[PDB]
Design a protein around this ligand. Structure first.
Ligand SMILES: O=C(O)[C@H]1CCCN1C(=O)Nc1cc(Cl)cc(Cl)c1-c1ccccc1
Length: 134
C-alpha cells in the first residue's frame, strides 16, 4: 500500500458518528447542522512527500498542503489553528492534530476501492466512507 493509492476525487456515501465527533470538539450548532447535512467531495493529491487535501460542498470549501512528517499550522473548518503532522504509516495516512492541550487523529485508508476516513477525539469516533468520482 502507498500514499498515491489515496489520490483522486472522492464523494461521501456514508457517515457514522460525525455529529458526535463535532460535539466532542464543542463545535457550535450552526456548523454542526452544516456538517450533518453536507455531502462533500474530498480531493487528495500527492507528489512524493508533498500532500494536498481539499474539501468541496455548497456548505464549505477548505484545503491544506503539507510535507509528510513535517509539523505545520493547519486551520480547520471549525476554526482551530492546530499543529498537525501527516504520515503514511502501516498502509494508512495518519493526520495528528494538537491544539490548546487537546489532540485528535484522522486516518484515511483504501479498502475495497473505497476511501475510509476515521476520526477520533477522546474516544469519540467517526467513520466516513467515500467512493471514487471518475
Ligand atoms: O473529511 C472528513 O470526512 C471528516 C473527518 C473529520 C473532519 N471531516 C469533515 O468532513 N469536516 C467537516 C465538514 C463539514 Cl460540512 C463541517 C465541519 Cl464543521 C467539518 C469539520 C472539520 C473539523 C472538525 C469537525 C468538523
Amino acid at each position: 500500500a502507498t500514499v498515491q493509492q489515496l489520490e483522486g476525487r472522492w464523494r461521501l456515501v456514508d457517515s457514522k458518528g460525525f455529529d458526535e465527533y463535532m460535539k466532542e470538539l464543542g463545535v457550535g450548532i450552526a456548523l454542526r447542522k452544516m456538517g450533518a447535512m453536507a455531502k462533500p467531495d474530498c480531493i487528495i493529491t500527492c507528489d512524493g512527500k508533498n500532500l494536498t487535501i481539499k474539501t468541496e460542498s455548497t456548505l464549505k470549501t477548505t484545503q491544506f498542503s503539507c510535507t509528510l512528517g513535517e509539523k505545520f499550522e493547519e486551520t480547520t473548518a471549525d476554526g482551530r489553528k492546530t499543529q498537525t503532522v501527516c504520515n503514511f504509516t502501516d498502509g494508512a495516512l495518519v493526520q495528528h492534530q494538537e491544539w490548546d492541550g487537546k489532540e485528535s487523529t484522522i486516518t484515511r485508508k483504501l479498502k475495497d476501492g473505497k476511501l475510509v476516513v476515521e476520526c477520533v477525539m477522546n474516544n469519540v469516533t467517526c467513520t466516513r466512507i467515500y467512493e471514487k468520482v471518475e
